[PDB]
């Protein structure tokens, strides 16, 4: 075991509306976006995102 | 003195309560869940990883015959082939032409890199909740860890806090759990001994350094075709590799209630669910005589401007008159309003600003300045911001959530209907008595 150097993606731009968010995501290579709700239901989205 | 609260199990949000003994000045109580651990009871079944197909050197007692034996090696497959005449670099390897028997052996091992890239199959039983508490009583802060079962008295020095049973029994782990390089998956692995070829757990062992490996990898030994010595074989794909390609996302990302899944030991940390019935036996010396604390002559609450949001979106000034300086505990006698402050300094005539948080669109609660309850009334407008980065300090009730204008309209409509039918009933009885007197 050693320590690797891994990329940090471009910080998303969050536009906020009533009961929701919009993430403006800039990715030059496939980057993984994972979401989940902090309640009993944990609807969990996983997607590999490339492009804007 | 014994106090029985019900702390919401959200880590970080302080829960405030006021304990009032007869003849003793009110004491401020402050309970915070700094951390939480949901630790299940584990049982390791086996360790699985990629297998190394070991094909020994072919044996040719090649004028005569060989017999297949039995070995304890993992997935030990053997086959005896009729007439071979094998070749190497050097020509014919023996003398008789078609009386030559070749024995093909093929078993399965643990790959050399398996000590790092392996999975552990576990069965986890009922989980136990353990919490870190930050009880603040008077001017003394005590940190302590308690088991959430209802009987164990976790105590730091002299607090003796008994964490009651959790209201909701929740466990993010299934019965069967797979751990691979710190990532926790909910997988239904085959039992020890039921190895399915091509699926997770096709090779099993108690440990990585065990000599009792059991495997079932579907090794089919094929009849050699070429003249050069060869062991042609075919096999199923590694179940570990197939599961790795089709594992899905881990519990670290599919957990409910915002649980943080951690390993060594397996636990779900900082889970926000349910209510905890804490019971604190505060030491006697912490309480002070009602004579020692300053006495409020009269106070009145005016509230500047309030919104109902997660953070402390409210302000409140109360003009008091005290006959002596000192420290007085402040508390909101309401379930939908929580104060940011706990103790404040009163000096004769003065006014102090107390920030609170609300879930109702009304500051319709009571505040106590070391006693002397006083009532507030104002309008809590909805917040302009839609999304915040901090949890809601107060839960959402019904009578609180409905505003007084909506209550007035609802009561106007319902009471109008009810008064209409009441007038109908009174004219009913009056007309009936008139008719009875008629005949």
UniProtKB/Swiss-Prot annotation, chain B:
Residues 84-101 are annotated as: E1 fusion peptide loop. It is a single-pass type I membrane protein. The chain crosses the membrane at residues 409-429. Class II viral fusion protein. Fusion activity is inactive as long as E1 is bound to E2 in mature virion. After virus attachment to target cell receptor PCDH10 and endocytosis, acidification of the endosome induce dissociation of E1/E2 heterodimer and concomitant trimerization of the E1 subunits. This E1 trimer is fusion active, and promotes release of viral nucleocapsid in cytoplasm after endosome and viral membrane fusion. Efficient fusion requires the presence of cholesterol and sphingolipid in the target membrane. Residues 430-439 are cytoplasmic. N-glycosylated. It comes from the Viruses. The chain holds residues 798 to 1236 of 1236 of the full protein. Residues 13-408 are extracellular. It comes from Western equine encephalitis virus (WEEV). Glycans are attached at residues 139, 245, 270. Interacts with spike glycoprotein E2. The precursor of protein E3/E2 and E1 form a heterodimer shortly after synthesis. Processing of the precursor of protein E3/E2 into E2 and E3 results in a heterodimer of the spike glycoproteins E2 and E1. Spike at virion surface are constituted of three E2-E1 heterodimers. After target cell attachment and endocytosis, E1 change conformation to form homotrimers. Interacts with 6K protein. This is Spike glycoprotein E1. Disulfide bonds join 49-114, 62-94, 63-96, 68-78, 259-271, 301-376, 306-380, 328-370. It is found in: Virion membrane; Host cell membrane.
């Amino acid at each position: 075991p050693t320590v690797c150097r891994v990329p940090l993606a471009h910080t998303p731009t969050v536009t906020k509306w009533f009961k929701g968010i919009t993430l403006h995501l800039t990715a030059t290579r496939p980057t993984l976006l994972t979401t989940r709700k902090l309640g009993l239901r944990a609807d969990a989205t996983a997607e590999w995102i490339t492009g804007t | 003195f014994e106090h029985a609260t019900t702390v919401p199990n959200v880590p970080g949000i302080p829960y405030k309560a006021l304990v009032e003994r007869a003849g003793y000045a009110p004491l401020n109580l402050e309970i915070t869940v700094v951390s939480s651990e949901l630790t299940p009871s584990t049982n390791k079944e086996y360790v699985t990883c990629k297998f190394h197909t070991v094909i020994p050197s072919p044996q040719v007692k090649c004028c005569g015959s060989l017999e297949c034996k039995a070995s304890s090696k993992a997935d030990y497959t053997c086959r005896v082939f009729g007439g071979v005449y094998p070749f190497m670099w050097g020509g014919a390897q023996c003398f008789c032409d078609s009386e030559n028997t070749q024995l093909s052996e093929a078993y399965v091992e643990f790959a050399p890199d398996c000590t790092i890239d392996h999975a552990v199959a576990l069965k986890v039983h009922t989980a136990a909740l353990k919490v870190g508490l930050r009880i603040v009583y008077g001017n003394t802060t005590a940190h302590l860890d308690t088991f959430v079962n209802g009987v164990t008295p976790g105590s730091s020095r002299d607090l003796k806090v008994i964490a009651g049973p959790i209201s909701a029994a929740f466990s993010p782990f299934d019965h069967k759990v797979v751990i691979r390089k710190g990532l926790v998956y909910n997988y239904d692995f085959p039992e020890y001994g039921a190895m399915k070829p091509g699926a997770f757990g096709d090779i099993q062992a108690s440990s990585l350094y065990a000599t009792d490996i059991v495997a079932r990898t579907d090794i089919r030994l094929l009849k050699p075709s070429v003249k050069n010595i060869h062991v042609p074989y075919t096999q199923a794909v590694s179940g570990y590799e197939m599961w790795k390609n089709n594992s899905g996302r881990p519990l670290q990302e599919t957990a409910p209630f915002g649980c943080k899944i951690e390993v060594e030991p397996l636990r779900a940390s900082n889970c926000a669910y349910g209510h905890i019935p804490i019971s604190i036996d505060i030491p006697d010396a912490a309480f002070v005589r009602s004579s020692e604390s300053p006495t409020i002559l009269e106070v009145s609450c005016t509230v500047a401007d309030c919104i109902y949001s997660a953070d402390f979106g409210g302000s409140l000034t109360l003009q008091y008159k005290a006959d002596r300086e000192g420290h007085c505990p402040v508390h909101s006698h309401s379930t939908t309003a929580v104060l940011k402050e706990a103790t404040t300094h009163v000096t004769a005539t003065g006014s102090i600003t107390l920030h609170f948080s609300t879930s109702s669109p009304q500051a319709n609660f009571i505040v106590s300045l070391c006693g002397k309850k006083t009532t507030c009334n104002a309008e809590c407008k909805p917040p302009a911001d839609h999304i915040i980065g901090e949890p809601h300090k107060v839960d959402q009730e019904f009578q609180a959530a409905v505003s007084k204008t909506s209550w007035n309209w609802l009561l106007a409509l319902f009471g109008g209907a009810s008064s209409l039918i009441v007038v109908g009933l009174i004219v009913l009885v009056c007309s009936s008595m008139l008719i009875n007197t008629r005949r």
